[PDB]
Design a protein around this ligand. Structure first.
Ligand SMILES: NC(=O)C1=CN([C@@H]2O[C@H](COP(=O)(O)OP(=O)(O)OC[C@H]3O[C@@H](n4cnc5c(N)ncnc54)[C@H](OP(=O)(O)O)[C@@H]3O)[C@@H](O)[C@H]2O)C=CC1
Ligand SMILES: CCCCCCCCCCCCCC(=O)SCCNC(=O)CCNC(=O)[C@@H](O)C(C)(C)COP(=O)(O)O
Ligand code: SF4
Ligand code: SF4
Ligand code: SF4
Lengths: 93, 96, 176, 328, 112, 144, 156, 208, 156, 44
């Protein structure tokens, strides 16, 4: 997204205001902005359905992932979300 | 090295040694950068029994320095340690 | 156990004295050294053709810091801040807030490369392999401000070098 | 809009809340102005038209992200706009003592100042500090002084609250006034119209002018007032040159360069201005109004002219030249 | 307590005066050697100012050590071990004067 | 003798660079005139060659492209022009060319490697990624 | 220096940095040797002796080098000890002292080498001592390459 | 204990060092205040500051104590003691292949006799001690700043001296020289409190 | 125009000469000097590019600040820098020279050589690899190539 | 199984660790004789 001033808003919700003098730093130079918003990317990821009451996520790749954490799926409305990865898992109804 | 035999002979003669035997530049004796996946071993304490840390806690087995003498409340002469023994001349090459 | 360097008496045999005087007058040893340099002339030079030819490097090489992402695309960094603590030069500045989703996502991940010592403690400390020093050693700038890397800069560096970084980690994670 | 609360102890890393666009910063007065802004912790926007190499001297004068260099063109209003948009203070120092191929005295002293003032007002710049000359007069024969006064009026028209400063023969290490006299060796002896016996000049120290400019920016009542930076004492031109050559260990020999395509050694207007006695305006505020106390030329004379020593006067003999007589 | 050099304050004052004489006589040469822009009076004024800064001391031991430090600075100045900037460092110039009036400090910042 | 063989090999190198024109081109663009098997070429245009006979350090080399990312590189051969996947092979981190072993494809990975943009208008300017910490009070808009 | 560049590669192969490695850490070493590193170390050490000899061929016997080193900066043995000199300085004057021998640390007690000892205390003898130390270092390196034991690389 | 994790300890050297410490104490009861041998076999002799020269001379010339090498002379600043600075002399006896530490105490004002007469190496070490900590050494051939700047003020290694210091350097165009200005850090050195609230070593517990 | 064409071509000629025959002075202060030597070592050979190490600072064009600029050394660096003839360029090698690196919070370390002397190229690393330093020099050469000193004089 | 970088079975080969500087040139008498012979031929 882009601010009304014309400055692209970072994924950290930061955009130099119109009254901000610091905006001059991008006068003749581009504002480095990452164009893959992480929050949107995980939202794309589908919610896995695992019958087991408790599932464990390592992030994939074993030692190349994150510390293994066990997620409980008792909550019916909510979907178990990985603490590190953020992947959502559900228990089939 | 990719040098003519004449150049090799001249080089060796000027050096006085067979340089082609030991060329500084590395060509093919180098190890392949891509290597098989390793399997490093485990340590002596990677066991499921008789592994209580109390028996291997060297950090906690250190003790405060022992006070041999404190001013606060025929013996033979004592050296700090047995005198150092004279070094022995090398047998591979005594004099460089 | 000990070797006597020097400590060699000269023989006074008339032949030995003659050869010593021959060395002095005819400059034999200087000629020997000259021949050695001449031999070095006809060797093959060891210069690589930079930048068309690059020097050898190992997968464990430590260079430009980079923030990585999970295969899904989520930033691996879960704002534990232990890489900030371990950093021996206090170069990493991390500020985090609960994201709209609710995960620990940093709002500020600033590392001034002008203060970092490129030790690699940060990548060894990170529990999710988020901050990993990349393979790029050629990132010289013309202004000091550029060296100070923002979180966005780190994310872009990760996105650019991810293929190589992942390959190197896959080639070295077993050793670590 | 662009109002910043000052925070810090006034050091290099402090924030003084002065976003300033110092036009013509790559100049004798420009360096000192930027240095004062930098040492206070101000965002000095430096518009430059020369090579970036020539602007490197201004780089160490400020902390990281405090000195910003951006290219500007005096013939482009848009360049002026993008360089003063976020600035709360704009200082105009653009002025060349000799006319150029594409820039005449009118352009440098009228057209460029007016464009800066007009753009600054549209951008909403709080204060503008134009730098005129004390001898500037609408009917003065010299084009330099005449054009400077013409632009001064136009600056007030475009920028009503502009704080116009009129220094008089600023002297300093990289000055074109003291060093110019001490360079009379190239021009034979000491070329002095009528032996320079009817000219009394009032020279001002470089730091005094620069500090006054910074003080004027801070001063809340300085806005809209035409200040005139005068020197501590008025010296006879002949006595002044005699003193200059004296401390410079130079034989005092009391006695075309416009053609030079490279920076002219001497200008006809410069010659007239040199032999023109400095005006005295007692109706304008001076350095004392801004709080800066004028520093006598004598104290700072050696710092500018000891470097011009010939053989053995910076050491050995080191004869002390007494202060020259002041016509006061 | 073992005295550093002087057993009594009067002995310490003797050492202080000896140091002051050396500094007073060295100032003219120092201006010549480092080509300083300060006057001989200015340097001698600074010397007196520096001596008067530590004029509240009453312990002879402390006075002795102050003289020793004063000697060391003189030795470096005489031996040209210090540079021109080092000598000028005594004369704080670039540092902006910090006001003492409470109202001024109130405006300047949160300075306590 | 072998001298004739050396001269003939030089002429072979002249031919292998595509005639005298190409021979001079590689001579004046790279200052090296040896030939090697074309391992692969990146999309940007840089061509990668390997000769095992050459000693370690010169076994693998890259001929930089003439135009990359809208920049003339006929003479300005920036060292950062090398794409990330070819960086491993060129710097001898791995013995496997990216052509033989393609790197794992990820959506977040860039589709166009950019050389060091320092000194160019596309340079990176540092800034804070956080927001205002202390919110200020808004005075009422209605006169009392 | 090209040989020094080769050895710098060994640093980078095992730590990832050419000069500053931080590889030897309290408790052991950071990581295990990358597969193949030891083999390359053997190759370098095999051809390194020739390089040292080439250095000697150009300096050791050269009369100009001797004139600039022989009978220069002579230190008496007693002065060296009193002045707190150590290493080559002590050995240069003939003092038979070497911590790797007198006070063995790590597995230096399990390696066999010879301590070069000077005779005149001049720069030339110390130059010879430093050269011989390089030679004896290769002797230690060969032993380590043939005695490297299996196990972990950090205290468990 | 045993197993690779624990460091092997040699008791023989411990006994030898304890015996030699008693030897030194008996020979020099006038100055020796306390003798300690660490569990890692390092003999330490605590001596009254007046005995710096006599004790060192004994430890250097005595036939059965030929510590003729001053390995390192340093100071430890403990602000909780009246004599905050602790001067430590590390010695080496090549004849008996042993090392010893002579530890003495001093105040900010009390001078300490220079050991240059005993060990010529002491010159620069004592210069460093004076420069970093401020411990004046009496009868020193040339006591002056050795590591700090020429015009530097204060003793840096003192525990009460700020890590970043009080002054910083920069080049000023107006004065055409490098000038010293009050220190202003763009990013304050972030102090990290790492000490755990739980006791780690019971053996070194100070009873309340 | 023809005048612009002549000036531009002459400016390119002047730019080529300086960038081709850059003469650097080794202001080796700390660890980074060692890697600088490895740049001049046979493997990389800065001289191959025309960059020959000029010991005399009075005949140098590039000052490579390699190491930690301490407060005691700070005046010397500036004084040497102003005694360099122009055009003069400063290349900061190493984090210590760039912004103090490991010693940024030290009591006697200048927080970057940028404060003392204006810097043109910053080479990152601790120590920056010899290729990275060589890369910085080539970047400086390209920086000189972009310079248009004559063109601006003509268009003034 | 454990696959650490280990010495090869049988270990590495021998490594030279002593000065190899060879002996080259004729005897002093012979070298002087050769020089004098060249001188004599030149003179004649
Ligand atoms: N003694 C004095 O010098 C006095 C001068 N003044 C006036 O005050 C100002 C002081 O200037 P000072 O700092 O001494 O600099 P100088 O007069 O020594 O040098 C000229 C300055 O003006 C700039 N400049 C000149 N012409 C142009 C142009 N056509 N386009 C853009 N910039 C231009 C230069 O920048 P660049 O080099 O990039 O072109 C530089 O900053 C001038 O306006 C001067 O006329 C008033 C009283 C006394
Ligand atoms: C360039 C200028 C350089 C100036 C350098 C001058 C110096 O060396 S500063 C160190 C001077 N310090 C001292 O003399 C310490 C004196 N200590 C005192 O207590 C004295 O005031 C006495 C002993 C009370 C004497 O006081 P009176 O002089 O009687 O009142
Ligand atoms: S250590 Fe890794 S997960 Fe933790 S804050 Fe740093 S980058 Fe993020
Ligand atoms: S690599 Fe070292 S210096 Fe760089 S961020 Fe990590 S811990 Fe800090
Ligand atoms: S940047 Fe690193 S290698 Fe260079 S001087 Fe500083 S600490 Fe040493």
């Amino acid at each position: 997204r882009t601010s009304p001033t014309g400055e692209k808003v970072t994924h950290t919700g930061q955009a130099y205001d119109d009254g901000d003098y610091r905006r001059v730093r991008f006068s003749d130079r581009q504002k480095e902005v990452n164009e893959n918003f992480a929050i949107d990317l995980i939202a794309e990821q589908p919610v896995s359905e695992v019958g087991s009451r408790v599932i464990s996520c390592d992030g994939g790749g074993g030692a190349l992932g994150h510390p293994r954490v066990y997620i409980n799926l008792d909550k019916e409305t909510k979907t178990g979300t990985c603490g590190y990865c953020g992947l959502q898992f559900r228990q089939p109804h | 090295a990719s040098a003519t035999r004449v150049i090799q002979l001249l080089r060796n003669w000027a050096s006085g040694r067979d340089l082609q035997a030991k060329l500084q530049l590395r060509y093919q004796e180098i190890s392949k950068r891509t290597q098989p996946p390793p399997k490093l071993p485990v340590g002596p304490s990677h066991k499921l029994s008789n592994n209580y840390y109390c028996t291997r806690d060297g950090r906690r087995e250190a003790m405060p320095p022992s006070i041999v003498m404190s001013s606060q409340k025929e013996k033979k002469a004592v050296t700090p340690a047995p005198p150092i023994k004279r070094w022995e001349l090398s047998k591979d090459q005594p004099y460089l | 156990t000990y070797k006597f360097v020097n400590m060699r008496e000269p023989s006074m045999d008339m032949k030995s004295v003659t050869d010593r005087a021959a060395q002095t007058l005819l400059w034999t040893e200087l000629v020997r050294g000259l021949g050695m340099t001449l031999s070095y002339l006809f060797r093959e030079p060891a210069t690589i053709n930079y930048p068309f030819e690059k020097g050898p490097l190992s997968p464990r090489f430590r260079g430009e810091h980079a923030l990585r992402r999970y295969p899904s695309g989520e930033e691996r960094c879960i704002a534990c801040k232990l890489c900030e603590a371990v950093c021996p030069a206090q170069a990493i500045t991390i500020e985090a807030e609960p994201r709209a989703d609710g995960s620990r996502r940093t709002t500020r991940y600033d590392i001034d490369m002008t203060k970092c010592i490129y030790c690699g403690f940060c990548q060894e400390a990170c529990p999710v392999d988020a901050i990993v020093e990349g393979p790029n050693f050629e990132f010289s700038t013309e202004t000091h401000e550029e060296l100070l890397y923002n979180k966005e800069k780190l994310l872009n560096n990760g996105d650019k070098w991810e293929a190589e970084i992942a390959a190197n980690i896959q080639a070295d994670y077993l050793y670590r | 809009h662009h109002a910043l609360i000052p925070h810090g102890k006034g050091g290099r890393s402090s924030v003084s809340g002065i976003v300033a666009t110092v036009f013509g910063a790559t100049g004798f007065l420009g360096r000192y102005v930027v240095n004062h802004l930098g040492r206070m912790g101000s965002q000095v926007i430096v518009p430059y038209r020369c090579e970036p190499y020539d602007t490197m001297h201004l780089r160490p004068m400020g902390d990281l992200g405090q000195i910003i260099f951006m290219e500007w063109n005096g013939k482009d209003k848009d360049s002026i706009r993008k360089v003063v948009e976020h600035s709360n203070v704009v200082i105009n120092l653009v002025g060349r003592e000799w006319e150029t191929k594409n820039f005449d005295f009118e352009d440098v002293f009228v057209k460029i100042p007016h464009a800066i003032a007009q753009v600054s007002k549209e951008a909403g710049v709080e204060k503008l500090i134009h730098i005129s000359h004390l001898n500037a007069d609408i009917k003065s024969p010299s084009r330099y002084l005449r054009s400077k006064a013409v632009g001064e009026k136009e600056v007030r028209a475009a920028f009503p609250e502009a704080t116009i400063i009129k220094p008089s023969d600023i002297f300093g290490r990289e000055d074109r006034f003291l060093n110019y006299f001490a360079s009379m060796r190239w021009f034979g002896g000491v070329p002095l119209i009528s032996l320079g016996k009817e000219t009394v000049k009032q020279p001002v120290y470089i730091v005094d002018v620069s500090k006054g400019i910074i003080n004027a920016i801070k001063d809340p009542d300085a806005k809209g007032k035409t200040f005139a930076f005068v020197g501590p004492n008025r010296y006879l031109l002949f006595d002044l040159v005699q003193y200059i050559f004296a401390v410079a260990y130079r034989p005092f020999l009391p006695y075309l360069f416009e053609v030079s395509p490279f920076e002219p050694w001497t200008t006809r207007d410069k010659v007239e201005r040199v032999h023109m006695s400095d005006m005295t305006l007692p109706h304008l505020p001076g350095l004392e109004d801004l709080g800066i106390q004028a520093t006598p030329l004598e104290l700072k004379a050696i710092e500018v002219l000891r470097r011009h020593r010939t053989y053995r006067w910076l050491t050995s003999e080191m004869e002390d030249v007494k202060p020259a007589k002041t016509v006061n | 307590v073992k005295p550093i050099f002087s057993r009594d304050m009067n002995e310490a004052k003797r050492r202080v005066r000896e140091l002051y004489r050396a500094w007073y006589r060295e100032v003219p040469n120092t201006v010549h050697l480092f080509q300083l822009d300060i006057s001989v009076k200015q340097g001698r004024d600074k010397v007196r100012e520096m001596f008067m800064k530590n004029a509240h001391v009453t312990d002879p031991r402390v006075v002795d050590l102050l003289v020793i430090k004063g000697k060391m600075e003189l030795e470096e100045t005489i031996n040209v071990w210090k540079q021109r900037t080092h000598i000028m460092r005594f004369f704080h110039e670039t540092e902006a004067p910090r006001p003492t009036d409470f109202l001024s400090k109130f405006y300047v910042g949160h300075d306590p | 003798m072998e001298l004739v063989q050396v001269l003939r090999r030089g002429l072979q190198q002249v031919s292998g660079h595509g005639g005298l024109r190409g021979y001079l081109r590689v001579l004046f663009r790279a200052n090296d005139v040896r030939v090697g098997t074309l391992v692969g070429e990146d999309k940007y245009g840089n061509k990668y060659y390997e000769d095992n006979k050459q000693f370690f350090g010169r076994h693998r080399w890259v001929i930089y492209t003439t135009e990359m990312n809208g920049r003339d590189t006929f003479w300005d051969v920036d060292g950062s022009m090398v794409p990330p996947e070819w960086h491993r092979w060129l710097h001898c981190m791995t013995d496997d060319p990216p052509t033989t072993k393609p790197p794992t494809a990820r959506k977040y990975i860039w589709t166009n490697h950019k050389f060091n943009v320092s000194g160019t208008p596309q340079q990176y300017v540092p800034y804070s990624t956080t927001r205002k910490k202390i919110q200020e009070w808004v005075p009422p808009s209605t006169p009392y | 220096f090209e040989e020094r560049e080769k050895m710098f590669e060994f640093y980078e192969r095992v730590s990832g940095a050419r000069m500053h490695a931080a590889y030897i850490r309290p408790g052991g070493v950071h990581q295990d040797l990358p597969l193949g590193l030891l083999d390359d170390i053997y190759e370098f050490s095999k051809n390194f002796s020739f390089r040292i000899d080439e250095l000697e061929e150009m300096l050791t016997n050269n009369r100009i080098w001797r004139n600039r080193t022989v009978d220069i900066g002579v230190v008496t043995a007693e002065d060296a000890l009193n002045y707190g000199f150590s290493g080559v300085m002590l050995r240069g004057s003939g003092i038979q002292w070497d911590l790797r021998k007198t006070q063995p640390y790590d597995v230096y007690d399990q390696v066999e080498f010879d301590v070069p000892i000077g005779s005149r205390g001049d720069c030339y003898d110390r130059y010879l001592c430093r050269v011989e130390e390089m030679r004896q270092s290769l002797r230690i390196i060969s032993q380590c390459l043939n005695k490297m034991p299996p196990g972990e690389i950090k205290v468990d | 204990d045993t197993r690779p994790t624990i460091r092997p300890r040699n008791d023989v050297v411990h006994k030898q060092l304890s015996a030699f410490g008693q030897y030194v104490a008996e020979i020099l009861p006038k100055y020796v205040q306390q003798v300690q041998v660490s569990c890692f076999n390092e003999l330490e002799i605590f001596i009254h500051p007046d005995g710096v020269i006599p004790v060192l001379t004994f430890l250097r010339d005595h036939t059965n104590a030929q510590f003729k090498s001053l390995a390192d002379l340093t100071a430890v600043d403990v602000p909780t003691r009246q004599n905050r600075f602790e001067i430590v002399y590390n010695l080496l006896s090549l004849r008996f292949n042993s090392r010893i530490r002579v530890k003495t105490y001093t105040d900010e004002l009390t001078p300490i006799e220079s050991s240059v007469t005993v060990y010529k190496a002491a010159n620069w070490y004592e210069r460093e001690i004076w420069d970093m900590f401020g411990v004046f050494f009496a009868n020193h051939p040339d006591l002056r700043r050795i590591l700090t700047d020429y015009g530097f003020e204060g003793h840096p290694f003192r525990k009460d001296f700020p890590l970043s210091g009080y002054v910083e350097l920069r080049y000023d165009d107006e004065v055409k020289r490098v000038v010293a200005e009050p220190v202003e850090l763009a990013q304050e050195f972030r102090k990290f409190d790492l000490n755990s609230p739980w006791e780690a070593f019971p053996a070194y517990r100070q009873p309340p | 125009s023809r005048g612009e064409y002549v000036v531009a071509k002459l400016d390119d000629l002047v730019n080529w000469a300086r960038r081709s025959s850059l003469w650097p002075m080794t202001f080796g202060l700390a660890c980074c000097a060692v890697e600088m030597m490895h740049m001049a070592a046979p493997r990389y050979d800065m001289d191959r590019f025309g960059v020959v190490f000029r010991a005399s600072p009075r005949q140098s064009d590039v000052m490579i600040v390699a190491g930690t600029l301490t407060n005691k050394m700070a005046p010397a660096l500036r004084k040497v820098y102003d005694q360099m003839p122009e055009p003069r360029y400063v290349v900061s090698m190493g984090s210590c020279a760039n912004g103090g690196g490991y010693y940024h919070y030290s009591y006697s370390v200048v927080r970057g050589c940028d404060r003392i002397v204006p810097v043109d190229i910053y080479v990152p690393g601790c120590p920056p690899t010899a290729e990275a330093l060589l890369y910085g020099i080539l970047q400086l050469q390209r920086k000189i190539k972009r310079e248009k000193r004559l063109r601006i004089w003509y268009r003034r | 199984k454990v696959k650490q970088d280990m010495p090869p079975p049988g270990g590495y080969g021998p490594i030279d660790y002593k000065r190899n500087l060879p002996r080259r040139g004729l005897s002093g008498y012979s070298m002087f004789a050769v020089g004098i012979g060249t001188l004599l031929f030149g003179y004649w």
